Amino acid sequence: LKKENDQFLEALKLYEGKQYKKSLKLLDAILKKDGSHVDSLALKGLDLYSVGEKDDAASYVANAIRKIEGASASPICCHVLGIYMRNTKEYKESIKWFTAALNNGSTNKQIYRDLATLQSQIGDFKNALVSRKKYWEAFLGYRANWTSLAVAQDVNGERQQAINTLSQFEKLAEGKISDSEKYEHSECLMYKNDIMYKAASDNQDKLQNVLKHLNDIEPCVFDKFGLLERKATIYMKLGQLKDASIVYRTLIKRNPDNFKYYKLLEVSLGIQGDNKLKKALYGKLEQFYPRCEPPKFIPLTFLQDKEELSKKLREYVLPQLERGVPATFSNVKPLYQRRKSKVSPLLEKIVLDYLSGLDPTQDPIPFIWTNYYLSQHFLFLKDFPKAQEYIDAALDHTPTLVEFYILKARILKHLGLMDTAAGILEEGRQLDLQDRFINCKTVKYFLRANNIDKAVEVASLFTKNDDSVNGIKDLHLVEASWFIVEQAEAYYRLYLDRKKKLDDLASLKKEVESDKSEQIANDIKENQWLVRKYKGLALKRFNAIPKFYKQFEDDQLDFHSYCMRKGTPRAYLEMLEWGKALYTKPMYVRAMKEASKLYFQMHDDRLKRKSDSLDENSDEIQNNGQNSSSQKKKAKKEAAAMNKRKETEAKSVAAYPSDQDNDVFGEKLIETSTPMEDFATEFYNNYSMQVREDERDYILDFEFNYRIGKLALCFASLNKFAKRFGTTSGLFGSMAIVLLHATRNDTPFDPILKKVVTKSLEKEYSENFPLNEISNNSFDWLNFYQEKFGKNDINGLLFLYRYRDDVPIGSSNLKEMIISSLSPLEPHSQNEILQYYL
Amino acid sequence: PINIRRATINDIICMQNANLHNLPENYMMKYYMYHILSWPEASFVATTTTLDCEDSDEQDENDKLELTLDGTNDGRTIKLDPTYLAPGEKLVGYVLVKMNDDPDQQNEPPNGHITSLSVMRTYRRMGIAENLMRQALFALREVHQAEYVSLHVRQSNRAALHLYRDTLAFEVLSIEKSYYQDGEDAYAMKKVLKLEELQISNFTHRRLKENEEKLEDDLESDLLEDIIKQGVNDI
Amino acid sequence: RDICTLDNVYANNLGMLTKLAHVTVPNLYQDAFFSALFAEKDVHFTQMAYYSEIPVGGLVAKLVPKKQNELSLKGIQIEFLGVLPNYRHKSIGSKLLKFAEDKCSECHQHNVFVYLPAVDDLTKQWFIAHGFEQVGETVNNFIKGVNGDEQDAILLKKHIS
Numbered sequence A: 001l002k003k004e005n006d007q008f009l010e011a012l013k014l015y016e017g018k019q020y021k022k023s024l025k026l027l028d029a030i031l032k033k034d035g036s037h038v039d040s041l042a043l044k045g046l047d048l049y050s051v052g053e054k055d056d057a058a059s060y061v062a063n064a065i066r067k068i069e070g071a072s073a074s075p076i077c078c079h080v081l082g083i084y085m086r087n088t089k090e091y092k093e094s095i096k097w098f099t100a101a102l103n104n105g106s107t108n109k110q111i112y113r114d115l116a117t118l119q120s121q122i123g124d125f126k127n128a129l130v131s132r133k134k135y136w137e138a139f140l141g142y143r144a145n146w147t148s149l150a151v152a153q154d155v156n157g158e159r160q161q162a163i164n165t166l167s168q169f170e171k172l173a174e175g176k177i178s179d180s181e182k183y184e185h186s187e188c189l190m191y192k193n194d195i196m197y198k199a200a201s202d203n204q205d206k207l208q209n210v211l212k213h214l215n216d217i218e219p220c221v222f223d224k225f226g227l228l229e230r231k232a233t234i235y236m237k238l239g240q241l242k243d244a245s246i247v248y249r250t251l252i253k254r255n256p257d258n259f260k261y262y263k264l265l266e267v268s269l270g271i272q273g274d275n276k277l278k279k280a281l282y283g284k285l286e287q288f289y290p291r292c293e294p295p296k297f298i299p300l301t302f303l304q305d306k307e308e309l310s311k312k313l314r315e316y317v318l319p320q321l322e323r324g325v326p327a328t329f330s331n332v333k334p335l336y337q338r339r340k341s342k343v344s345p346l347l348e349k350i351v352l353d354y355l356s357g358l359d360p361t362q363d364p365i366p367f368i369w370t371n372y373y374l375s376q377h378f379l380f381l382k383d384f385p386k387a388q389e390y391i392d393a394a395l396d397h398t399p400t401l402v403e404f405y406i407l408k409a410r411i412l413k414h415l416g417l418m419d420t421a422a423g424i425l426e427e428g429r430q431l432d433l434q435d436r437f438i439n440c441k442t443v444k445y446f447l448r449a450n451n452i453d454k455a456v457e458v459a460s461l462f463t464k465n466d467d468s469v470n471g472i473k474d475l476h477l478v479e480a481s482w483f484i485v486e487q488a489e490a491y492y493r494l495y496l497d498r499k500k501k502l503d504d505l506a507s508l509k510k511e512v513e514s515d516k517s518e519q520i521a522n523d524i525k526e527n528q529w530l531v532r533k534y535k536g537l538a539l540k541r542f543n544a545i546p547k548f549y550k551q552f553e554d555d556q557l558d559f560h561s562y563c564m565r566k567g568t569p570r571a572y573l574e575m576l577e578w579g580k581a582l583y584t585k586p587m588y589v590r591a592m593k594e595a596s597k598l599y600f601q602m603h604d605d606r607l608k609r610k611s612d613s614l615d616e617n618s619d620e621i622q623n624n625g626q627n628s629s630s631q632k633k634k635a636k637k638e639a640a641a642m643n644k645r646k647e648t649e650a651k652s653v654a655a656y657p658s659d660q661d662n663d664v665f666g667e668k669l670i671e672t673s674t675p676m677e678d679f680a681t682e683f684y685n686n687y688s689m690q691v692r693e694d695e696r697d698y699i700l701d702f703e704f705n706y707r708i709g710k711l712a713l714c715f716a717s718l719n720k721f722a723k724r725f726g727t728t729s730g731l732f733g734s735m736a737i738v739l740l741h742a743t744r745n746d747t748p749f750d751p752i753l754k755k756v757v758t759k760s761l762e763k764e765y766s767e768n769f770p771l772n773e774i775s776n777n778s779f780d781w782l783n784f785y786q787e788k789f790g791k792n793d794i795n796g797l798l799f800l801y802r803y804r805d806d807v808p809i810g811s812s813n814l815k816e817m818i819i820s821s822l823s824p825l826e827p828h829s830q831n832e833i834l835q836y837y838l
Numbered sequence B: 001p002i003n004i005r006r007a008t009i010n011d012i013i014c015m016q017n018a019n020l021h022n023l024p025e026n027y028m029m030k031y032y033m034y035h036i037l038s039w040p041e042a043s044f045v046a047t048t049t050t051l052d053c054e055d056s057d058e059q060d061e062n063d064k065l066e067l068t069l070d071g072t073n074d075g076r077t078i079k080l081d082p083t084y085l086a087p088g089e090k091l092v093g094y095v096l097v098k099m100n101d102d103p104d105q106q107n108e109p110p111n112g113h114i115t116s117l118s119v120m121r122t123y124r125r126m127g128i129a130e131n132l133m134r135q136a137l138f139a140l141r142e143v144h145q146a147e148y149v150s151l152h153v154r155q156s157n158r159a160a161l162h163l164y165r166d167t168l169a170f171e172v173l174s175i176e177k178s179y180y181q182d183g184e185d186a187y188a189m190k191k192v193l194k195l196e197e198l199q200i201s202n203f204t205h206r207r208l209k210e211n212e213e214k215l216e217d218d219l220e221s222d223l224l225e226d227i228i229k230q231g232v233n234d235i
Numbered sequence C: 001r002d003i004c005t006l007d008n009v010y011a012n013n014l015g016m017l018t019k020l021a022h023v024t025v026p027n028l029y030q031d032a033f034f035s036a037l038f039a040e041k042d043v044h045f046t047q048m049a050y051y052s053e054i055p056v057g058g059l060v061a062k063l064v065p066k067k068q069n070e071l072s073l074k075g076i077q078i079e080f081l082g083v084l085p086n087y088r089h090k091s092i093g094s095k096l097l098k099f100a101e102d103k104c105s106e107c108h109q110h111n112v113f114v115y116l117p118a119v120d121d122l123t124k125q126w127f128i129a130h131g132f133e134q135v136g137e138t139v140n141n142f143i144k145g146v147n148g149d150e151q152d153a154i155l156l157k158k159h160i161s
Helices: A003-016 A019-031 A038-051 A055-066 A075-087 A092-105 A110-122 A126-138 A143-156 A159-172 A180-198 A202-216 A225-238 A241-254 A259-267 A275-286 A294-301 A304-323 A331-338 A345-355 A364-380 A385-397 A402-414 A418-429 A437-447 A452-460 A471-479 A482-508 A522-542 A545-554 A559-565 A570-585 A587-612 A631-652 A675-689 A698-705 A713-723 A730-742 A749-763 A781-788 A795-802 A812-821 A827-837 B007-022 B029-037 B129-143 B158-167 C014-020 C092-106 C122-131
Strands: B005-006 B044-048 B084-086 B089-099 B110-118 B148-153 B173-175 B188-192 C004-007 C042-052 C056-062 C076-083 C112-117 C139-144 C148-160
Touching: A003 A019, A003 A038, A019 A559, A038 A055, A055 A075, A075 A092, A075 A110, A075 B029, A092 A110, A110 A126, A110 A559, A126 A143, A126 B029, A143 A159, A143 A180, A143 A570, A180 A202, A180 A570, A202 A225, A225 A241, A225 A259, A241 A259, A259 A294, A259 B005, A275 A294, A294 A304, A304 A345, A304 A522, A345 A364, A345 B173, A364 A385, A385 A402, A402 A418, A402 A437, A402 A827, A402 B110, A418 A437, A437 A452, A437 A482, A482 A522, A482 A587, A482 A827, A522 A587, A545 A570, A545 A587, A559 A570, A559 B029, A570 A587, A570 B007, A570 B029, A587 A675, A587 A698, A675 A698, A698 A713, A698 A730, A713 A730, A713 A749, A713 B173, A730 A749, A730 A781, A781 A812, A795 A812, A795 A827, A827 B129, B005 B129, B007 B029, B007 B084, B007 B089, B007 B110, B007 C042, B029 B089, B044 B129, B089 B129, B129 B158, B148 B158, C004 C092, C014 C056, C042 C092, C056 C092, C056 C148, C076 C092, C092 C112, C092 C122, C112 C122, C112 C139, C122 C148
Parallel strands: B110 B148, C076 C112
Antiparallel strands: B005 B044, B044 B089, B084 B089, B089 B110, B148 B188, B173 B188, C004 C042, C042 C056, C056 C076, C112 C148, C139 C148
């Protein structure tokens, strides 16, 4: 060990700059003479990972790791390994390697800052505080160190220490602040105010001191919105009402279009009990802002007189109908969610009286806007023929509006006509090809109309077309979600339709002379193969949204240092909250539920087709053999044609690169080994570790914990659901019946778990569900359910129909009851349930 | 309705969805994260608001109302909709504004740069983008002390032209040939910003006849007079 | 500004123009006639009349620079003139004719001729009231429909100063 270290030191400068081939050549020349060099292998792994290679880089890194016994080597190798782990989404190993390097003897304090970022990604703040303290004591000439120390002491719990540190820093640097460093300083001041907020509590002297400090720093703080908000909060936490009212009036003068400021002023003034005071206040404020909308929308929520309410509604709808806004119904969208038989008749009467005095030629714009508003109002009131008549009259009057076509497509979708709606919306979109919202709506409605190829062809227009025949790669690079969700649902519907198709084809079973279904089977086989391939592609596309969220969370590497260098601690806390709440999105929950349903269906049908029927030799023959008719050449030609078609299909639906993911066909995802383990270690642990209290889907947790052998979690979730959302829901009774049928000794599980669940049920719910009817086969649970919770619930009936194999409570009677109970709903939902859910 | 507020990070993903329904030139998550964590006192958002309106009561009471499943029973969750932000709140538009930070070897003073302004086409023609731009310019002038503002506009989009050149009254600076991905020419506009002209209180009225009475907000006024229950001016 | 505005018809919104021929005079035009307008050798002039930011009028004309193999009608040929029945009696057609005459005068021309159906009297009187002159009588077999219907046509000319 003499010349190899010199060559490594002379080649390290190539990696330090912007050189890769010259360093790789030197590493190869070194390894050609001695292959047992750990530093050279560790550098070559990172060099191959930084240029594009993945397999060779991982192999070299694994070899370098295996060629290490103790923790006593050069710190450069450990630093390179830490960089590699940081670049390969490995935080624990990177932290361990950096700690081992710093424990050996490194004179580079900046490495400590790296740890201050790494642990900042895993939440380990106990050692992060010490790392920040060391990195601050190492260099005393940058405000980023002070900001990082303040943030670390505020997040942990050292509030007084952070206040003292900020005070000492401001005393030492009083007057030595440049111009560009003023704003940041102001931001820091605001952050200190936030710290003082944590020292506010309910003490009078503390709040007075915070108010005095805020009034003293007001001439120095540049941010005025947050300053005035904190001032109003302090005034509300004390007792001064006039000063708080003045602050809120100043905020309104700064920005009148804000419902939050108006609500806070209403709460501060204490006039929420009397209606005349609020009426006079809003009538006086209307003269100050005649062009706003909250001052005219909020007073429509506490009116009791019918004549006054009608007059206010008329004065609110007259300017909107005169100027013509594409959101008039939106302006009354939330009110319709809270009022109905009391407000909607008066609004309809006013609109009819206004329309009876208009003219289709003198005032065409108010005429068409009144027609659109009437169509919206009737569509909201479950009316369809009159809405279609109004939209047809509007199209005949002025066929140059996209909103009319959008409303027609929405009505046709609500009436179960998806294809006609897609056709009308495409025809309307072809009128002007410059808007993207209408294109996205058309693609979504085509995906909802069992039309995927045309939807993709329409979407492949505004996308960047380079190394692909369509724009699927561009749609995946712009970070999409709704498109994938809407396309996977169409794939699932098309796959479920094939089940009914095969059932109808097998119901004949070659009845008498039925050679038509026997002589024609190649097309059916090709259609089934295509449907299976698209179903696999759907499962492949499902593995994207969680991966996208993981990539978004991992891309916060340089942000931990940027938020401290630029001086944005409040933005850092906001980013932390955003990263913690990432797993609380509705689209994420929907995608996770769909993935769970798919995995459970795959587990079920795999365990069903594993050991069933008989004669495997007569079933594993398939085709590719016509006896004495050249079977080898025929099978070879068939395989060649299938491969040639699959290559073109994969190039058409190309989304992921070939060097990044080889599972393009998706055959390995639909035939995995442990689906439940993968779903728990990839899709469930994150949602379990990052979740609130009231926002928690108990149905998905119950479905996940049912088929694993753990019933205590099921009982806890059921108890929490009954305590939160009450006990008068059909879902509670359905889950209780499912649990009672699962605790039967006939089902192969754990007798101890069944016994403890039975004891818990007998101890908790003793006068709700008969727990002594598990031995009688004549007791019908459907009658008891419809007597207690009733048959009007749809979610409970859907859950009982989904879990009917393990709970024998009938089938035909349940289906008839569901059909009879679905009638007071919308036709499209009824059709979808009868076609797929039933 | 329309509610203007500051662009929070907890919704930027949904904001990106709005981009998918607006300008074709999309951006990655890093772009939006940088522009939302670098200067948060510039970019604003416009969403909806749903509050109470006579709960239960007695005058034509009905417990079978909608209210996004929040009245009686029907659980209490959020509707499956990527455009929603809260049970009764959805985003209708936003405006992203950045500051000059790249080196130019010329000592450029801190100026305003309007990055993007995207509002849903179905929710326009009622004062949204104009208010967002006014609030952004006022916040920049009050906090960052922006000397001027510079932005870009297209050509076929007559709405943006009427909003910037006509409504906001901006001055055209130069013409950039082939700037976007489609190879369409753009107009780079620039206007010197001031402090005594971008006040919101000076733009409370849309149009006027000739000589009206522009009333603003002075000191106290709402806590004066007497109780509106038995006075002279009590209805 | 004025409630009646003018705009130049682009290509992206060209699909809207084809819709006008289906809500004005049905059974007269096709699809290729509107598709070959902006397909990248006669000069074509397009104009879209908005009424309160709403597309209500359309004017598509063709310029014929030939004069050697032609009698006497060199000028702007008003081809498509689409005006909705609900958007009338507001000088919309008058503004369209004024814009057409302005574009004819700017192209060094002093003649505007238009073809009209023979079974329509209201439109004939409306175009005559502006200031047109009939050229002879009718033309035997000139208008061709979609399905194959044929009828006579009349020519109305005007001299531009």
